[PDB]
Amino acid sequence: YQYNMNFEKLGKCIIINNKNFDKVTGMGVRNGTDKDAEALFKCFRSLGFDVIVYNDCSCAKMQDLLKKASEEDHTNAACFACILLSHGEENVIYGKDGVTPIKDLTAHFRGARCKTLLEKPKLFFIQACRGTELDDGIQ
Amino acid sequence: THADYLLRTGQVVDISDT
């Protein structure tokens, strides 16, 4: 079969758009990320999600943002999606002030931590570096 | 290295704009 989409709403969709970083982190300004956030907003909104965009989120915000999101009631929701735009590194995404493991963000929706979404799809779209290797291509 | 710097700081970008 397929997931049951017979619910009031498709679901909540959170977009985290980190562009400017703290001088300390040494990370650069992600020019063109607003272009991605505007397109993603327009796109997922048309699919039917209730999209909210948060900018230059610190690591503390990102965690909370997702923790509280998982504390809500998705009983009438079909699924859930989160889009992360930021600098990154293997198993890690950058907040504005530091780095955060991707697994700590997603953990808020694991079983007992969000019974409302059990048996429902949890989508994480992640636009962030995962190292510095470059694909040279072939043929 | 410099190339490495730009990459670890995430400054390298596609210039295919033009």
């Binding site: 079969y1 397929q2 997931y3 989409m5 017979n6 619910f7 498709l10 992600r30 020019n31 063109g32 990320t33 272009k35 991605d36 397109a39 993603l40 327009k42 796109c43 997922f44 048309s46 699919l47 039917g48 079909a78 699924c79 735009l85 990154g88 293997e90 997603t106 929706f109 694991r110 079983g111 007992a112 979404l117 059990l118 048996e119 799809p121 949890k122 989508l123 994480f124 779209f125 992640i126 636009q127 962030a128 570096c129 995962r130 190292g131 510095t132 290797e133 470059l134 694909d135 040279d136 291509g137 | 190339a3 730009l6 990459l7 390298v12 970008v13 596609d14 210039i15 295919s16 704009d17």
Partner: protein, 92 residues
């Protein structure tokens, strides 16, 4: 009883260890392509068909350019991790 790790799906812009591209003028390769595919099939195709087409679009239609030679003509391929148990259609 169901596994607590089930029903999660990750759509990464690049494979593990690599760099993810973007142009300050048009934005990320991954996003430009996700939006384009979703804009045309978001309501007709299954999640994996969509993402699979995004994989092809960014693989075939994108290639970098830079004044620096160490960053010229590079490529990229998205990575999809699925722990999903059913087909997913956005058409409610």
């Amino acid at each position: 009883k169901i596994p607590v790790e089930a029903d999660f799906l990750f759509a990464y812009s690049t494979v593990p260890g690599y760099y993810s591209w973007r142009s300050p003028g048009r934005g990320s390769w991954f996003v430009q392509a996700l939006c384009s595919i979703l804009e045309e099939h978001g309501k007709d195709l299954e999640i994996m068909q969509i993402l699979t087409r995004v994989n092809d679009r960014v693989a075939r239609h994108f290639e970098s350019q830079s004044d620096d030679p160490h960053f010229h003509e590079k490529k990229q391929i998205p990575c999809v991790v699925s722990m999903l148990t059913k087909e997913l259609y956005f058409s409610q």
